[model samples]
Target chain A: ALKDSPTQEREELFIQKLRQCCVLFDFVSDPLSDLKFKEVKRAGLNEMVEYITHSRDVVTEAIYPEAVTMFSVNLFRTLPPSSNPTGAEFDPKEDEPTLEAAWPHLQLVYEFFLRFLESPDFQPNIAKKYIDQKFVLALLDLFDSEDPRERDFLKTILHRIYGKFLGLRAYIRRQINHIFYRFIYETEHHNGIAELLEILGSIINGFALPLKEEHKMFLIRVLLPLHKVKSLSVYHPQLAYCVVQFLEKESSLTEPVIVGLLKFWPKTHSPKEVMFLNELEEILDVIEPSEFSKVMEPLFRQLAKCVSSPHFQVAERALYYWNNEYIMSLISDNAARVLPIMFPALYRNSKSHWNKTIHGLIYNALKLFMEMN
Target chain B: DEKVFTKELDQWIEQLNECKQLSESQVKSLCEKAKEILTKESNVQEVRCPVTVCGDVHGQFHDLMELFRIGGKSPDTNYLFMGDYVDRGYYSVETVTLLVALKVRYRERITILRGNHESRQITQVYGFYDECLRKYGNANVWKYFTDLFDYLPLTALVDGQIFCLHGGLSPSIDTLDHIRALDRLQEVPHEGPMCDLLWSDPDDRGGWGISPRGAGYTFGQDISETFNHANGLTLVSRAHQLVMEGYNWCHDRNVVTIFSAPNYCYRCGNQAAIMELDDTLKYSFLQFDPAPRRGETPDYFL
Candidate 1:
């Protein structure tokens, strides 16, 4: 009733009511147990969202950490279904307050976080004060959210954090490496592995040049080993992105990375293999001519393996690399060195594969071969 | 009374909401009718004020649903989708099919232009052709859609203030009349004015240069100034690149590039936006995140 009141007395009463509503944030109360308390909780969440929505020039420094933790914890918190102790049969419908139930609230939480991230006035403060190793770890835990929606939001939010909070980038990378170590060693399948690597791809894109040891360690230890997972294609594009990002930063690392990539290359006709072939072309395009000779033999062996594969996708992607003039220019002089090995394999595939798509790709490869000569 | 067609269109629209596919013949007939309607539009279709201009969708069906929710429903709020209705997401068939159905039903209320991905060669390389095959157990739907894509209008002029196209301007063409003179019903060529309209990008330098995309030319600010002056336009809006904010203003705001695919290709980490032009000619950009796509499981390599 005092929502629009301009009288000082009425405004004082409104302020008092709002302060009382702050009890909703109290951890001691069972706010969800009663309708009255829940109504107060809704008012608190609503006021918080409104504060964030119109937070321009409003000092949010004090509330930022509390908001992030409250939203993130509650949104991700899950409990087992409640049970009665008096020998009552278990009720499946008595599931605890799952994140799914609080999804609407979480949506607002994500919106609040996005707004906070976008506000340049407050971003520096957030980066310096609220973001830390624990904060980054909290986000990484959210990365494994069962809801793909929440995971998707986390992808962009974590990327923003990585970009804005320069100090946290290393911690973010190390924490993600820890998660990868768990996945690699324990063989525990998590849902957001692809999403996490995608964020890594962007962070890798931001890495400084001349190559840092930590970044290289990330590539060799965390990223390259990730290729061993059978479902690499689902995340191959991002994986390819991180690989190319590292390659672009320091071309000198091309040979070792390429050799490592080929060492763990998918042997089958999976989509991951096709995607990796595309990344191979991307790396080959950017590889320095000086570095090309070092891994020439193994590179051609991997190329020939791709071309000779019975799978049409493998052969087609292999030919695509060969088709690029940029790639051709880099390897043109050395082409003669591998031509004898490459041509015969190309010839064998064209004649052996009766598949129309495979034949057309081989035909293109042969035509490009003639042009190159 | 044409009630039969409306009834069928409504059924398809409803089924599409539930994420179900229409039969091959249903897609065929829908394409035929949409082609008939689209053929009547000019190569540079003339759209009026008070319409919402959108950018590349790239087959995020739920996101498109969220777009309608945010931008307001069709017929009530006129829409012009700026191409890329397929590929790189899980639901190309449903995405494009629903748009075509909406066009067939609300012919005057919606506009669908052709993007580079609508072509057969691009589709075969991208995921659209394979998506059709996987979803329908055949390529007949792919053939039908590609054939119909040939007839889609290539560009649009919004109240003579904004020159909208899938990509940026072409050096080969200077005016809207030049865009109108060409026949648009064919495969997008690898080079030339038509290809440039669908593939050219804006750069910070002056004049046209080679595009790293290798298909289109990269135009600069001076060229945009020249094009806008020559066409008497205030702005040129295009979508072929993913901007981090869903929309980017380049060339001192003379050219705006809007990308509507959030977290494009599922990992670009970019927001999506749409441009709203009210009757008074004021511009508002509505930016949104990826939709809450609950229950859509990731496809692991099984």
Candidate 2:
């Protein structure tokens, strides 16, 4: 009786606690008749997580199954809805970012799951029984959360799952690709694109040489087409980092990436164009001379339009690019090829660009070019 | 022969006054009309007395609204602002828009001159360019505002006695006529009269010394007095540098710097001020602390 009891009541008590934690409080709705009661519940759950965290050696057994199932009962669900569904025209940059009141309890739940994943006591091979496909799909769905705090916790938890579970790696990447597909082809929205790209940035760096064709397709299709969205500035930095990371891993993707940038290159948008130039400058840092020879014609052609762009910001950045001595170092050998293509815009700008600052830079560049040629 | 866009101007002014942004087109037209008015204005734009000369708003739109509360409203209490209008604060677009709108509607009631921060290159490196793109979702509004800047007069001669500008005396500018003789319709240049007028500072050391600010010179009491005497100027009123006391007098009171964005970028704790001149040209400084914080408490950070 004592030997059975050594493991017996403990499992039942953990089950009881999990059931008690099952009452998910509503964070936003109408008036609360019992705000104090909700706070009490929230604090109680927090204290329970704290106990569970620091006291990880709960001398465990069948309860891991029960506790994880408790998480499934608690965490998995659809959010209320997108605040703005047809959101192409909306720019949320002006408004305060959305915050979730549910974060108090939700963060604790995430923390509990995180602690579960990090535990040396928990075996991944067995944990995979409950941490199966549907479980991760629910996890991926939560990435659309408007609350960055929730998004961050999910980011870290998912990273751990990928690191330890290992079996879920391909499934996770493919699901994220589908999320991008829906974001690009369907909604043109979703809150965590930037956060998602950040994780992708880490993943891209971890890729070994002679990278898989599947990885190449994702870069070309999902990531390159990412530039097509109107909200590029929100995540462009991370996206560009991922793009460059791909190039550094295998220098051959250089041409498709450059061509892709030029293909989606913003025409009606100046701010967007400015960002592209910023990315372009960064992208140019890694080019081989051979790749330079291939892309240089169209590259200079697009750049030349900017020199003559009546919008001075566009014109000035384009001119500033030519003055880059290192960039010129790569271009100097092909001076005759580059000079003829850029000559008209340069000549036109020298005569009549509205901004004198551009004029002076153009003249300086032209005089320098003339002597060099 | 301006139209009764006063009704329209008031509407835009009312919208901007409420800290609400105007439509992109409203800004476009506002800059267009402002261009015509500013174009007609002289390089040495002249202003009358009974005016309050302020400085370096640098986008603090909320504090700017408080500034109006301190020194009366636009039409009732005439104003002259000495540059640095857009950059370094959270609301550059709003602050500069409201000012430009006021100038557009009440041209005789207010004067806006160019500051070092008004240039295309400078505003981009600072904050307004980035702000414009963020607020309106494009850089065209930034383009409109900057193009409008090319027409802003370089200096404002207040009733022919006090010379108001964004920065101090330029060694290249010997007299008011010298500044007047230079081109004022292009971008602020890097190494000429255009640049120095918005970049120079005053110093205790005698004669023309090189300015630490790179583009402008540091004029000693001798340099200021000579320029003041030659131009028949009673004072050089400017606002490029911040003064902890809100206003600083140098060149032995030959020049005064009035900084108007209080708490300078929301944390410097320096007092801000405006110089009020009555009908008789008698001047007094009206100094103030920053407006109450965005709230009574600190904002939440993650």
Candidate 3:
């Protein structure tokens, strides 16, 4: 029909189709609540898809941001398992078009929005005009999507937004930090903690030196408190990554960060504790001798605990720290102080450790100790 | 005969195994020979028993060296590396160079199959491209390695009992012959049997479902069962996804996912593992932690 129609008629048909899709945002005479909206929405979405695909620039500039905001808000509102505490499933048969049936449509909208954002012609204006604190919050909220595909796209899109709109990074970071802040401090469970930390990990890499108050506050307020969570191993790597990013940016932060980490050091042995050891070694590699000396006592205490730990994985990992030539050099300087604590544990573990792997690691540690001395 | 070539390869292998970089010309020649050797293999190569299967060595050359220590060195221990030898770590050049060198030196002793990370597009996204650019000051070696990767086998038939691939089963592929029939000497497509074989993951649900990865489908237990039954495979061993203990058995042990890159990406904080299939069809798994590297800081974060 479009091919057969005259030029004006075709333009009318295209605008008519876009108008129908634009009804997706009608909150009052809510088209999304109508049972027949699926066919209409699908037709409208298809036209928009074609419109964007063909580089329909003027209409895209006019409607793309509004459509994104509409879909983003609706996606946030319709999240099923996490948003709904009543355990009620999204029944597409009985509920509105914005229920489970609409998720794919919404996801497609976000996908198109990503495409629009990536287009060089529209990206600068779209980001400068539409992306703001509220829009960022909407996106950060969408990070909680149970769908990995959605989260994956959202990560790249957010990274693009961060890159394009330099001013928005601080707002995005603060908003995500608040999400983590509530999750860590107020006993709120956030399904998107890992995703949030993942975004922060990238953002943290972009942070400038002579770290700002907000950066330090984020580390102390948000990141430091995250270790207190019970099931840390689930999010340990990303959380450790955020801390490690800060350490890499401002290597002097290593002492305070490590000392803070030791406060929540798993009182009992767990994989989380082993994660802490991995992170500690990462920090120790970057830490200076002066900063290393500050946290040396508590660090040695924790190191001793890990070495004397009956668990082979833990002890070997602790012994494995000595394998780093730079770490060994740092230890060599404080050997007179640390050896008194480390030697007895090493002696006991070497004699009684059952696993051959652990024995080899202990011997390797001893060899390093011998070499260092 | 091949003595001079073998002696030169030994020097290269020793240099790489010591975590040292080889000259660009040496890498270019080694990749050329490795490509010749790998090209003669099938899309689904048939590997004999008594081979130790490894998964996903995303650089981490020292950890890979540790793998050889625990699993037994190459030639001495028959090796079947399930791709992903590059990217995400600091030493992809050394890591992949050593593996390819070993493949050239001991063609029968080691088997190398393609993983998803072996492609040009994926390497650019992940770290191999930049690493080569930084390390070599050019992209010629990366170009060479990726060109050779086009000839890599996508799957391996192990003793006719295990079906091994990088990712998982695809809806398009029903039999081992279907895999062998593929025109695999090209870039991995965005979606197809080849993409699915390198991108899909197994799910708890039954039947083939859309994967969150967006390219491949996440097959369920029933899909695994039917695929295995149809292919006469008792087990499907794969290595795309990371498992906590280094190896995991899902779909009632019909599928085994082994991730050999310990502390994958230097932040996964997980163990690495290898699987050994003896001549009697017996199976034993050897797991190890990340290897210690002197002065090797994690180059991932910033």
Candidate 4:
């Protein structure tokens, strides 16, 4: 057996081969323009394919991290379109003027992937056993890229990936229960059930996560679910409104569950229910207050009443409070006349409805009024 | 007659409550018995079933309720809803529930059936889950309603000769038994052959063609003629394509499409009408306006 560490001779030979392959790709990319430069390279297109295919098998078996990374870079790096007859190089940037120029290529690649998916070779059994060890994590990172072409490619990959799971659900359930569970766990897409749960988890931490982390989780939970679930939970007027629907179904929400979701509630409700409630309230005050005030004033009033009044009749008080305040807010002329009719307004307004600017503005005014007093 | 109809309806509902546990044949027999009682009281000739045969009505709840107010209550004297009670519209939960309740309370007078939209895949995307969460807070209720949707009848044989369904002849549907053999209890298959059956639209051309709605496979006129002739049916009525006048005579009037929600959820802006066959088997279409204000066309976004 070969030594665990590569000898100098072996290392040099691998490096030389990789360099030669890179140069070959570069020359082939602009063949007519760079033919004289290409004469130095000895391998023909068929020979190069044979070399790479053999190299991939050997390198994968050898488990060389560099070889895998090199293969990925060669496959995906920005390059000019080549007239190479072999058509083996899968360069995404070829002739792409802007990142967006790669869309057509991405679309073609997607169709190719889907066609591959339709073949029996792309089955989850084959994927998990053969492809997963080599490419799964790399594929995940590919999806996380921001370029338009990359994003489209990722979406196609995601659809194909999910399609495999969907197809295998009935056939594989008995043998691969854990695989299915992990699939759901790993799925965590922007608008999916798993991702939404993660967002709910993040909200409990008060959105104090780093901006990237926050954005990622938000995309996963709010945006992804909005795109995928097609339920009113994504489109409803308030998170509480949807929670109320759940509440109607369940006897009561546990404290932890309440705490987890309270982060997303409108600021006008009990501040204690929401994390960073003061800041959110301030944000709402400036940018969102007037229109939402119709919803908030009664909501706050009722919460305050609930807090100050007797606790002995909590359920009745809760019912009365919800009926008189919450349900009334929805049914009252302010809400009822507006809801389904203004569904578009409510939906479009969602992203900015509870903005921090409004919250800050309201707090600033209150501060000034206090100073005046 | 009305009292007897009420009694029979109660009995049918009682049978429905026990339907799931019973075998398919038993449930079918019970349904046939209910149909017999209904047909007996529901005079095909003199009684005329003074009714409405509606298409989709999808959970556009307020519009459907508005339609009820306009069309008058069923068994004024009998009503036939031509399948597709759920999906596409925003109020499918309420629409299906109200229709089922009506079916329960007035089984002899009111008839509801399966439509392409009643399929699970269609319901999931086309506002069934949306409406369910909006109204009931959980998708389970939507699933329950949809499961109930599957058990709904697929064909409407009006006056025992005119055949109605939600969609035209599917390629897989070589015989009437092919339709009967469909295991509708399963949620609609998301794609492939079944999708063609549920989502395919009829063509005005003498030939069947692909649907532009991003769904449904193409169908040809030959398949339509073969299916109609083989079934020994005079005319095949269906609803899936939107008809500007609430009804359209396509394929030289052999195929008729009827829609029920007037102004069609404010986007479609089509009139809603139904076909009524006289005692002599002469069919006439009824054009009526839905209650105007609640569902007039709104300005859709660009």
Candidate 5:
């Protein structure tokens, strides 16, 4: 309803652009058989996004509501059902991810939603009415989208909303928590956990010092148990960042996380164990001496088994950890405590590990431990 | 055998020419027939002159299409590809399928020898295995192609003068007769003569040097000179290393390396080349860039 804003020239111009942007072209199978049709729609959306993003004119009362409605109509919807039917036997690595056929239009609408929310004229109070809890939940549902490009947009834009609204921060975090609970405990499937955690990784970074009690629980009950899922490899890196962020912000949370890892340490899967060891080193690097002793006995006890892993890479990785001078210093500090636990695995690996690299590392690592003794 | 499925294979070829993949069962039957033909081939497969030699399509399907356009199509023009046909591109399934289908269809016209990338261990890690899973929604096609790979001739002899293989001269291998004698019907071994054949590279230093690629040795001009002289060969044509100019001559023209995937890995900015050996065995290097893309659908800018 271009209602002719006589005084607001840019306002009337943007109103026309919003309705122009709402026109969708055929993006289903064979979208490219006719190129010009696709290109024009793509350019129109492009111009609308760039014009709104760069222009300083206040997004007037007329522009904001229609724009949100347009985004809702274009962007919000159920993603195609996941093709990898869920089960313990279904290997995602062997299955294909579904690609969005409508990505061409969907992507632009996402861009407009993002830039408009961040616009200085976009007042949180007015924006909150359009982007309500229902709208946020619908946006959250889009994460199941198998496409990384769409997921990437969700990550950035949701973070923007979480930061600016402040009021929706807890609700957004709680909703993501519910989704994770469903992901970890029940469904055991979801494509966007990694990107979701990627968002939280930054959110955890901005956490205030003397971290809130609720944030600490999020680390223990929420983040720690993420390890127990079968698909830990999918999201472990971002999960690691979120856990490590909590530790960096509040050192007291360190022991619980160290033990949390041990509590869920993968015994049967050598590769997952290797992944755990990789993340463990990052936590160890940031750990203070005070937090070190609280977890060292259990830590090296698990590290000892890693040294004895029949799988050569795991054995080498664990032995490789001892080469770190700082880690060795901690081992030396716990010499009164950790030697009996670690000695057998070291000697066992030296004699019979299948990998030559593991044998050589054992030789170097053992000699140093013996010298320190 | 090629004629019975001449119509069927033609459709599969036409389907894939448009970048569409064959069904799992379609790929299954295709490999079954392909396996029989390849199994009888010698490790040093014989090739007559006037053949176009290519290297490392690397699963670039459109580029391979561009390749056929530039080098002339097979059947009418004899083609022998030195491996690395799978992996590292967006269309491994289509690229390997098309080549395997062509080899099956034009049995006497096209000869495919294994490159370092053809092994099951490699395709899984690179791109082909992943692409197979994505395209066919299963590992069955991946299995069939890998099984077919074991039968691929290790090397080819063009009129028995120009020795063509995927990688550099192996130190463990002194003569073409040694390559022919070894058991070439299994997975590419990690060491020994067979491993060295596919894994080795050429280096500037004299004698044999360590290959930075880990599995193969880097042979020098001295090694190339010794081997070619012993075999009575004019040159060794191989492809494994990337050359910005599409083909590189090492060992002072005793060996020529032709790389066929232009703009390698999609942005290395390298031109791809093929070597055309005439009836008289004169060499012509024909170079071309990556195929012209239809269009790039622009991303939503911030």
Candidate 6:
């Protein structure tokens, strides 16, 4: 009776509920609304495809200004057509509202115009202004709107902006970061520590030249938490890549800060950590244990060895050599072995750097590995 | 003076005709002679003529000529062409070539400055190089011409009381001399404060801000006000925006926009207008329709 009941009304309710579930699922998939979700779903048109092909940093560099521009333009453009308070179309019989009702949008555009009028020529500052000027307003407006269609459109546009702004190319890839971050922050899921590290590893590994001071700070503030919960290096081999990027630029993170996290990582995982650990384990399940060790073990050895290396400067310098070829292969091989198991305690307890003595030890081992090449 | 003059009032017209006929070498020789004359002291302290400030030519030569016809022929008024003589709108080569030719002939009378479009990004995106390749068969010549564009000044002291620029005032720009100090002979790069100057736009309210164009930087009203005050100027006349009816009297008209090239790119049907300022800095607005071409309707309507 439940399966075959011809209660059409009840069936419709069930279907509506199903559709709502799907929408909620879609929203849940992208808490940050970075365009990656849509890219996987084939949203928008051709322009995005061409844009997505670039490296995430470059895309973030290139697309932020345009997205801000589009937001400003659309904000103003959509206002006129939507000015009436009543849902009904404009009638000649009723008194029309003043143009000042649309002043906020106009003011936003004007503010941009004025500030840019005399400022020095640079991209980062311009981009910062764009975010400060547009993002917060759009976020509030889009999040609070009643119409689902407009909400969806705003969501897509906002996602496009965030994606273009943040450098996430695939919705799924983006959700892994944003959804996890939201679940962690909003729900206070402690397990986010590991994923945050994974994301940080990804960003660090893919680091590029000419990052603004503000961007560097954003990375430190927003991305460091994850590395503490789990040994992020285990899952994201590319972190070595990021470290290599830093080395290439002759910039190094405070070594003690990151490595200290690793030394003190949680062995007994929390319920949330266990859930995340299980999910990640599911992902690692496809790989052989030995292979996982190959990817993560070398990285751990390198970091662990860094603590004891005698050639501090040389070991620091060797980090630059870890681009995809030299160090990444080792990191990838050992990712599963080290990341899931050691991350939480590393995040929680790794605080003090073992000092220059430790740095010297790791330095020489990497030198030996590097000299072998 | 008599031998060199050869009909003083018509000097520019003769040079135009000669350029139309002369070989490249002959044109170079004439340009040298014109340059020499510019260096010499003239008999008259040369009454400063009222020049029409035009912005962002972007290679729309036909529209430029139409603008000239509407604004009246040059040389009666020394012309202050505000940069951006090249890139976009097709015919960048022709537009620049003609401007350079005119600059050589009227070296003292015509002044050209840089626009963001003069920068490589605009050339690369807005069809300056591609158009040059199509028009001239090489990117090398385009490089040479764009180099000449760099030689163009960044700002013009019109009547010593107004500042005219292509893009919005830059945040990095502190004084008129700051603009004058630029090398103006190099290719633009991927970053910097100068890049922002070339690409930035003006906001209507508050302090200096960011441009939404994504191409360059932006400035605030405070910067604009400061720049004007520092330069001892009353107003900033710039072009780089598509103003309806051809111009906007914005910032309470402290910023008067002068965008030439009527029916811009044949896309915006706004008329191009100019401000004619006398030596005393008294100004007059000149508005007119561009001369019509045969068989085509003037795109003045929606």
Any runs in candidate 5 off by more than 4 Å, and if so which? A1-9, A30-41, A83-97, B1-171, B175-194, B197-214, B217-302
Across B83-156, the per-residue lDDT of candidate 5 in tens digits comes to 99887687878888899989988888988889999886676555565456556645578788888999998999
Candidate 3 DockQ category? incorrect
| Candidate order, lDDT descending | 5, 2, 3, 1, 6, 4
**How much does each candidate deviate from the true structure in C-alpha RMSD?**
16.8, 9.6, 21.1, 22.0, 12.4, 23.3
| Residue-wise C-alpha lDDT for candidate 4, range B1-302, written one tens digit per residue | 36875675555444433221223343344444434433332101112334456776855666775666666755464667766766655445446555665665666667775667776555544545544544443334544555565556656667545766676666666665666565554555645544556677677454556677776655656667776788776777778778778888866567788888776654445787777655576767777675544322000111
Q: Which runs of model 3 end up more than 4 angstroms from their true locations?
A: A1-16, A22-47, A50-61, A72-74, A83-103, A123-132, B1-302
lDDT of 1 by residue, A53-84 (tens): 56355434555655455545554444333231
lDDT of 5 by residue, A1-373 (tens): 2233455576666676787757555667676665776677678678777766776765877777888788877777767767555543244454466777888778887888888877877888777777778878988998888888899999888888888887788889999999999988887788899999998898888888878889888888989988877678788889988888888888898899999888888754445677899999989988998889988989988888778765555677787787677888987888988889888878876777434677788899889989998
Q: Model 4, A1-373: lDDT tens per residue? A: 1223355455445445444533323432343565544444333222333433433223322323343343455344443332211211111122122343334233433443444444433335534443342254444434323354555555455445544554432232222222223333443222222322332333333322333443343333443222122122322333332233333323222222233333333221111222223222322223222334344444444334332221112212322322223333333434433333433422332233122333343344334323433
Interface RMSD for each predicted structure: 11.3, 12.6, 19.0, 17.8, 14.9, 28.7
> For model 2, what is the alpha-carbon lDDT of residue B19?
82
Candidate 5 CAPRI-style tier: incorrect
TM-score of structure candidate 4: 0.40
Model 1 stretches astray by more than 4 angstroms? A1-373, B296-302
User: Against the true structure, whose DockQ is highest?
Assistant: 2
Reproduced native contacts, each prediction: 0.00, 0.00, 0.00, 0.00, 0.00, 0.00
Q: Candidate 2 lDDT, tens digit per residue, B139-166?
A: 6898899999999898999889999988
Looking at candidate 4 chain B, the ten consecutive residues that score lowest on lDDT are B293-302
True-vs-predicted CA distance for residue A201, candidate 5, Å: 1.2
DockQ of 5: 0.03
How many residue pairs clash in model 6? 71
Native contacts retained by model 5, as a fraction?
A: 0.00
The per-model lDDT (C-alpha) reads 0.76, 0.81, 0.76, 0.46, 0.82, 0.48
Best by lDDT: 5
What value does the lDDT take at residue B239 in candidate 2? 88
| Candidate 3: C-alpha lDDT | 0.76
